């Protein structure tokens with residue numbers, strides 16, 4: 484047939500071709516109503532018009548390839564040119580070229596991802612692909628991710644013109660270090676200049692009980708007078724747990740390894756961690772005491788920290 488290529492979205496009056504010269508048709512053989520226009524085997528609006536004065540085919544209306552052909556790779560208008568004296572029918576095909584007049588667009592602007600802190604590196608997360616109503620090179624080609632030490636993208640060709648996008652955990656997460664990672668995902672087409680679309684991804688690091696309680700010091704040394712009354716404050720122990728909520732909540736207790744006698748002599752407060760004197764003290768009975776104290780989590784798997792209190796009884800009278 485006769486074939487022309489017209490880029491979409493040209494303003495009316497743009498020249499397509501010289502039809503009369505191409506088909507060897509004298510202008511006298513052309514008249515009103517001599518141009519028929521078809522799309523997909525059905526008649527269509529006057530996207531094109533033929534000038535009877537110079538035999539030129541030109542753009543008569545806005546031609547939007549996206550509306551016409553959507554995602555189909557080829558966009559073709561079928562024309563019939565009708566001549567008389569003698570009667571002749573010439574078929575013309577007009578290809579509508581795609582331009583990069585659309586940007587890549589994600590279905591949503593904001594995405595939220597929940598990842599447990601225990602999740603090990605090399606884990607992979609589904610992320611939704613962007614869409615670009617253009618075709619070929621003008622459609623989505625590459626993705627890039629905002630700078631992150633923890634996450635990277637994997638982009639793989641899948642079919643003819645679509646790709647698989649995967650979010651990959653490259654480095655371990657630590658909620659105590661950072662609880663929320665802000666990521667921007669950018670989709671880019673292959674048009675020149677390239678057009679972009681972005682989506683925000685918020686990565687929330689869920690807490691695991693991966694920290695055990697810890698005292699400021701391993702060992703405490705205290706001098707206690709033997710005549711110290713019961714309820715006397717021996718020492719205030721401070722333990723801390725950086726985990727979240729129940730996982731960082733501590734209860735103080737004396738270790739089971741402590742002797743029965745010491746439990747009678749000494750007591751510790753479960754919440755505050757104040758070690759106090761319970762029973763009367765005798766330097767003759769004992770020169771020293773060794774109290775083992777532990778602090779425990781309220782997490783699903785309770786975690787513990789330990790320290791030793793060394794009590795020096797001071798002789799009186």
Ligand SMILES: *[C@@H]1O[C@H](CO)[C@@H](O)[C@H](O)[C@H]1NC(C)=O
Nearest residue numbers: 699700703718719720721722
């Ligand atoms: C525990 O913390 C309190 C509050 O700052 C402080 O007064 C006390 O000395 C601390 N105890 C120890 C053993 O450091």
Ligand SMILES: *[C@H]1O[C@H](CO)[C@@H](O)[C@H](O)[C@@H]1O
Nearest residue numbers: 669671676677678679680
């Ligand atoms: C759209 O914009 C992004 C940055 O926002 C570019 O990286 C891309 O190449 C396109 O120009």
Ligand SMILES: *[C@H]1O[C@H](CO)[C@@H](O)[C@H](O)[C@@H]1O
Nearest residue numbers: 592667668680681682683
């Ligand atoms: C992602 O970022 C681009 C460029 O900052 C915005 O234009 C877009 O709307 C989204 O916020």
Ligand SMILES: [Ca+2]
Nearest residue numbers: 547548549584
């Ligand atoms: Ca268009």
Ligand SMILES: [Ca+2]
Nearest residue numbers: 581582584617
């Ligand atoms: Ca287009």
Ligand SMILES: [Ca+2]
Nearest residue numbers: 585617621672
């Ligand atoms: Ca595009």
Ligand SMILES: [Ca+2]
Nearest residue numbers: 657658659693
């Ligand atoms: Ca941690």
Ligand SMILES: [Ca+2]
Nearest residue numbers: 690691693726
């Ligand atoms: Ca934790």
Ligand SMILES: [Ca+2]
Nearest residue numbers: 694726730780
């Ligand atoms: Ca903990």
